[PDB]
């Protein structure tokens, strides 16, 4: 068992989140610094996010050790994932929800049915707090429990593009992101992000409380913003490049507006409808924890 520090698991160097950039392992914050936003005439106002459902989907009798982190990260940032709600192994997180369950969530991002040797795993209390919320990804497809997949993106914009005044206001102009760019920059970004061990982030996010939580929320704001960025590019209506005197600025229109697009494109990862419903759910839960 991995001990959880007074800070999160994210304080451990083992769980550093870092996109590749200019040939180096850049922190998400030093990528987001490259970003710049042109305003447009449209306005985003953030509606209250509906409380996530009480229901925890059944962890069906599964003999296998589900690879959950891979399923989640590929469902959110995966270049090729589709029909993510067909298998429905996300429900498996609710095996971890129970008090004194035999099941362990390994650092590998796998949900072992029982504790097993030479596989380090997160502290079960932490995982229980984490599962009590994120098992609800397992009902992202069921019609009764689906998240709104349009309004939620406003929050995304505010949490990404939004200046501190726009965030305090709860309302920002719809923006148009841009940054100096290398070829395939968003594909490479998203793949650097799929490799992130985000269960560390989500687990500290659900387990930590008090100042120790708030100290986490500032420290990892940029990380959450990078995840939000990859999703944003996934749902952006269009993603052009601009020549700018022997330099190129990648430009996505628009931050905070889900275009509901599903036809694939070379520039960025694409959501099938299932990935849209899933991502909407994920945002519902995660933003719910993020604002409390």
């Amino acid at each position: 068992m991995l001990q959880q520090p007074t800070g999160g698991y994210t304080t451990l160097e083992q769980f550093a989140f870092t996109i590749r950039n200019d040939g180096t392992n850049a922190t998400p914050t030093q990528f987001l610094q490259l970003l710049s936003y042109e305003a447009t005439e449209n306005e985003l106002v953030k509606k209250t996010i509906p409380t996530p459902e009480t229901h925890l989907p059944s962890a069906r009798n599964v003999p296998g050790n589900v690879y959950i982190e891979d399923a989640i990260t590929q469902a959110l940032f995966g270049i090729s994932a589709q029909n993510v709600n067909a298998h429905g192994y996300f429900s498996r997180l609710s095996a971890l929800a129970l008090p004194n369950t035999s099941a362990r969530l390994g650092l590998d991002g796998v949900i072992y049915n029982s504790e097993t040797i030479n596989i380090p795993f997160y502290d079960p209390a932490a995982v229980a707090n984490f599962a009590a919320t994120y098992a609800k990804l397992g009902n992202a497809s069921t019609p009764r429990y689906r998240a709104d997949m349009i309004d939620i993106y406003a929050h995304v914009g505010l949490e990404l593009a939004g200046t501190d005044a726009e965030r305090a206001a709860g309302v920002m102009p719809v923006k148009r992101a841009k940054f100096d760019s290398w070829e395939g920059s968003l594909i490479s970004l998203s793949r650097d992000v799929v490799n992130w061990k985000i269960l560390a982030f989500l687990i500290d996010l659900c387990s930590l409380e008090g100042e120790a939580l708030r100290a986490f929320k500032t420290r990892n704001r940029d990380v959450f913003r990078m995840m939000l960025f990859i999703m944003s590019t996934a749902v952006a209506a269009n993603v052009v490049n601009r020549k700018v005197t022997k330099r190129v600025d990648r430009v996505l229109e628009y931050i905070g507006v889900n275009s509901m697009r599903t036809a694939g494109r070379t520039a960025t990862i694409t959501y099938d409808l299932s990935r849209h419903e899933f991502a909407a759910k994920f945002l519902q839960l995660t933003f719910t924890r993020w604002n409390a």
């Binding site: 029982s114 504790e115 040797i117």
Partner: protein, 89 residues
């Protein structure tokens, strides 16, 4: 016409077969509303996990799928020692 052959004979065959050495499981408790089979696994800290009862789809043995139409020949295409000159050991 067929019931006495069931109740007054075949039932005894069930009662004996139930005590046979190899019939080691509790198949049913008579209450459809609540009965759920006991579920065991071989399992180790080394990480082996072998369920005794698995859902594996049709198998080569042919015991897995159930044709319920078997009910018909029984009701209307079978003799029995009790039902059917009519003395029979």
């Amino acid at each position: 016409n067929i019931a006495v052959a069931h109740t007054d004979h075949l039932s005894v065959v069930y009662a004996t077969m139930s005590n046979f050495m190899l019939n080691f499981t509790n198949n049913f408790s008579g209450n459809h509303a609540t009965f759920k089979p006991d579920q065991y696994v071989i399992t180790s800290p080394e990480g082996s996990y072998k369920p005794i009862i698995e859902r594996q789809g049709e198998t080569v043995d042919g015991l897995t799928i159930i044709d319920t139409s078997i009910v018909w020949p029984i009701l209307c295409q079978c003799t029995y020692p009790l039902v059917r000159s009519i003395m029979e050991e």
